[PDB]
Chains A and B, each alone.
Chain A
């Protein structure tokens, strides 16, 4: 019954992606 950190809308971000998943985007096996 107490409120919980549950996403309300389908396009809501309840918790931040954080650093580790953020750096995954920058990954590219092709050398620059």
Chain B
């Protein structure tokens, strides 16, 4: 049939990923940026939306939602009649552990994003774009703004974008250190001037978004690829990838490989095909692999024998009870404490929770305390089942998707490494002289005169 992967250099998108050119506008025009943007703007927003519809573009923020459909949600029946401003909010906060794509997009090829704000904007016919950058990416923001100034200076963005009679302007709003501030309703509130606690939807942001105005939040990489798919065609984009997994995409290959880096590659590339061809191989050889976290901290860990013949896309990873997330492929060796790796993530999720809702503000700490115990083995194996259904109590009950973000990693670790955990409990149960009580108290706890309720 058809084998996916190894696309040529002449079908790539982010050419300047390795810093071969300075980020100034003059070199950007050599790369095709701002080439036919005037003709693109004159064509109606329907043409832009339908083009991204045919390309099969799905959001690389993590949910993977169809992109043309999402942007078209903002074009309601009587959108013209309302006098309120319309906003394109751009998700430049990349806080997902293992992820580094957008840092490269803004620091290397900024004018691609800058035109993407207009083209995504004109699509959803917004009147202003906001770029919410991670607060740590202070150097990245300065580059991106300098790109914006030249975009205003040359007339590309402003009161008359490329002479098209369109009103669009671009502003950057840096964050201040909150991973919850990547969630789309949390991203709205933070830019509004509040703590970044997410809103609940039935109110959907395409209607009541930023300052209660119609807005769309889209990730950097999704926005940045829009201008090229317009100028090159969505059929050409849809050439790459499987039937519902089209396009190229940026992969962060970090962890236990010989040469960790980030490279863009066609969707549905097999996991095997990717790491030892674009990254020098896993350290110690393929047989010395243990597990791969495919989409970042949120997606469940994937062991050796499942990752043997696994394609890296949205559908195959979802089929494997995992996800592509942002394809922050974290790869771990056979000589590393896997359980310690996941307990450091449930510690990450404890620190990033906003605290607004009960099942996450309490649950992200409860599971973090449990994971440090399972790290030491201070428990009985029945606790493993208790931790499985604590997480099921978290999914779907929270205001935002940061609840699943800390339930999924634990569920994967129980699903594929339960022999590991029970061994550590057995090692603990050997050392102190008996199976610990549920909670981490030693077997002699009642003997030593401590509170021990019947049952733990």
A4 on the B face (CB < 8 A): no
A18 on the B face (CB < 8 A): yes
The smallest C-beta distance from A25 to any residue of chain B, in angstroms, reads 10
Which residues of A lie under 8 Å from residue B266 when comparing CB positions? none
A1 on the B face (CB < 8 A): no
Which residues of B lie under 8 Å from residue A22 when comparing CB positions? 142
Which residues of A lie under 8 Å from residue B152 when comparing CB positions? 27-29, 31
The smallest C-beta distance from A19 to any residue of chain B, in angstroms, reads 4
Which residues of A lie under 8 Å from residue B139 when comparing CB positions? 19
Closest residue of A by beta carbon distance from B171: A27
Q: Are B142 and A27 in contact (CB under 8 A)?
A: no
Given contacts A20-B174, A27-B148, contact A32 B142 (CB under 8 A): no
Size bracket of the B interface? 10 to 19
B5 on the A face (CB < 8 A): no
Size bracket of the A interface? 10 to 19
- Chain B, range 166-185, C-beta contacts under 8 Å to A: 169, 174
Q: Are A24 and B145 in contact (CB under 8 A)?
A: yes
Which of B63-71, B80-88, B153-161, B299-307 participates in binding chain A?
B153-161
Given contacts A29-B158, A29-B169, A31-B158, contact A19 B142 (CB under 8 A): yes
Partner of B138, one of A18, A24, A29, A32: A18
Which residues of B lie under 8 Å from residue A32 when comparing CB positions? 153
Closest residue of B by beta carbon distance from A27: B149
Partner of A23, one of B145, B154, B158, B160: B145
A26 on the B face (CB < 8 A): yes
Q: How far is the CA of A28 from the CA of B149 in the complex (A)?
A: 7
Point out which of A18, A29, A31 has the most chain B C-beta atoms below 10 A from its C-beta.
Answer: A31
Which residues of B lie under 8 Å from residue A29 when comparing CB positions? 152, 158-159, 169
Q: How far is the CA of A16 from the CA of B350 in the complex (A)?
A: 33
Q: How far is the CA of A32 from the CA of B174 in the complex (A)?
A: 26
The smallest C-beta distance from A28 to any residue of chain B, in angstroms, reads 7
Closest residue of A by beta carbon distance from B148: A27
Which residues of A lie under 8 Å from residue B146 when comparing CB positions? 23
Q: How far is the CA of A26 from the CA of B159 in the complex (A)?
A: 17
The smallest C-beta distance from B382 to any residue of chain A, in angstroms, reads 50
Closest residue of A by beta carbon distance from B138: A20
Q: Are A20 and B142 in contact (CB under 8 A)?
A: yes
Q: How far is the CA of A23 from the CA of B142 in the complex (A)?
A: 7
Partner of A31, one of B141, B142, B155, B174: B155
Q: How far is the CA of A31 from the CA of B149 in the complex (A)?
A: 10
Q: How far is the CA of A30 from the CA of B153 in the complex (A)?
A: 8
Which residues of A lie under 8 Å from residue B174 when comparing CB positions? 20
The smallest C-beta distance from B383 to any residue of chain A, in angstroms, reads 44
Closest residue of B by beta carbon distance from A28: B152
Which residues of B lie under 8 Å from residue A23 when comparing CB positions? 142, 145-146, 149
18 more CB-based (< 8 A) A-B contacts, given A19-B138, A19-B142: A20-B142, A20-B174, A22-B142, A23-B142, A23-B146, A23-B149, A27-B145, A27-B148, A27-B149, A29-B159, A29-B169, A30-B158, A31-B152, A31-B153, A31-B154, A31-B155, A31-B158, A31-B159
Between A and B, 11 residue pairs with Cβ closer than 8 Å are A18-B142, A19-B139, A19-B142, A22-B142, A23-B149, A24-B145, A27-B152, A28-B152, A29-B152, A29-B158, A29-B169
Seen from chain A, the residues whose Cβ lies within 8 Å of a Cβ on chain B are: 18-20, 22-24, 26-32
Seen from chain B, the residues whose Cβ lies within 8 Å of a Cβ on chain A are: 138-139, 141-142, 145-146, 148-149, 152-155, 158-160, 169, 174
